[PDB]
Amino acid sequence: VPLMELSGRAPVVRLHDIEADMAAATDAIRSQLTGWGFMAAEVPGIGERVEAMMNEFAAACRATGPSLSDYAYDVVPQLAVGGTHGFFPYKEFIHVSGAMIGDQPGAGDVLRAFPAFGTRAAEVFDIAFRLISLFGEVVRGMMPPGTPELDLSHDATNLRVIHYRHEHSGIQMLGLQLPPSDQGLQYVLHDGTWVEPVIAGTDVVLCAIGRMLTSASDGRFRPSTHRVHTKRLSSVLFAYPQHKARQWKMVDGELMSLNATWGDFID
Ligand SMILES: [Fe+3]
């Protein structure tokens, strides 16, 4: 599989000028989606933060004292309506939702128990959520006039961090892949050929179309199907709208509100 270099080629988006750099990068981002099926930006400083976070997750996964499995999803308080956050033991991974970061109560205890990791995760979540919200404003701008705002939900969005680890797409609106520890993640182009973005140990983030946005755009943007081939840590933000909010579609240029909710889409 061919390597796809993105350092020095994707638009630069600085941590302290995110909104204005993403405005400048709009046309480049639109042409990536048009021409590749996924999106990319280089965020100087992000890799340093993500590496520290992943390395602290790996140390936490080996904690014999307060253990991460003390915060397995089935012993963590969950929202009545929403996804499942917390730790998923063994390949082993954690879902840090925006609700968790706001302690929505006891749900935040895994971050009090592992606060070095938890502080990085909250920081990376905040950066990733601002980026991914602006990626969604770009995609909205490519859709017909009268397309609603994506209304990504802080609380319903989660950051996944994976320790030990087939072609697939996310079910959510957008995914933002953060620089992994190792190469192996691969994306398919519009012509069915696979590329391996060069992202391990970089500052490059990849933004993926998920199936909710494929549906909301009525198939205009295919999901950014991807896979992982190995020769290990990784994190990705999964952005969701409010589960109880009403589905919509832009069908043939015209806005349709459906009865089904975004929660129903997941089920
Ligand atoms: Fe994925």
| Bridge partners for 38 per DSSP | 208
Return the DSSP state at 59.
Answer: H
Give the type of residue at 215: S
Helix axes 115-141, 26-35, angle to 10 degrees: 80
232 is in an annotated binding site: yes
Q: What type of residue sits at position 257?
A: S
Q: How far apart are CA 139 and CA 167, in angstroms?
A: 23
Range of the domain at 253: 3-266
- What span, in angstroms and rounded, lies between the C-alpha atoms of 231 and 229? 7
Tell me the two tokens of residue 150.
């994506």
CA–centroid distance, 239 to ligand 1, in Å, is 12
Q: What is the resolution of this structure in A?
A: 2.3
Rounded to the nearest 10 degrees, how much is the dihedral formed by the CA atoms of 207, 208, 210, 216? 60
192 CA distance to ligand 1 centroid (A)? 18
Q: What are phi and psi of 111, to 5 degrees?
A: -80, -25
The answer to whether 226 is annotated as binding is yes
Distance of alpha carbon 198 from alpha carbon 204, whole angstroms = 8
Q: Give residues preceding each break in the chain, C–N over 2.5 A.
A: 90, 104, 165, 231
**Method used to obtain the model:** X-ray
Phi, psi (rounded to 5 degrees) for 89: -65, 160
How many angstroms separate the CA atoms of 52 and 69, rounded? Answer: 21
Establish how many alpha carbons lie within 13 A of residue 229's alpha carbon, considering only the half-sphere containing its beta carbon: 10
Bridge-based pairing state of the strands 86-88 and 158-162: unpaired
Nearest-angstrom CA–CA distance, 235 and 123: 13
Please tell me the distance between residue 170's alpha carbon and the centre of ligand 1 in angstroms. 6
The CA distance from 250 to 120, in Å, is 38
Q: Which residues partner with 234 through β-bridges?
A: 162
Q: How far is CA 247 from CA 83, 169, 190, in A?
A: 17, 19, 27
Question: Is 73 one of the annotated binding-site residues?
Answer: no
Half-sphere exposure of 124 (CA within 13 A, CB side): 34
Q: What are phi and psi of 41, to 5 degrees?
A: -145, 155
Using CA atoms, how far residue 144 sits from 35, 216, 259, in Å, is 19, 12, 22
CA distance 60 to 118: 10
Q: Ligand 1 centroid to 227 CA: how many Å?
A: 7
> Annotation-wise, does 211 bind a ligand?
no
Instruction: CATH number of the domain at 77, please.
Output: 2.60.120.330
DSSP 166: -
For the chain, how many structural domains are there in total?
1
Give residue 93's identity as a one-letter amino acid code.
Answer: F
190 is in an annotated binding site: no
Reading the block at residue 117, the tokens are 């990791």
Distance 176 CA to ligand 1 centre (A): 9
Q: Tell me: is residue 85 an annotated ligand-binding position.
A: no
- Decide: 171 and 108 in contact? Cβ < 8 Å: no
Cα Rg of the chain, angstroms: 18
Tokens 């599989």 found at: 1
CA distance 232 to 204: 18
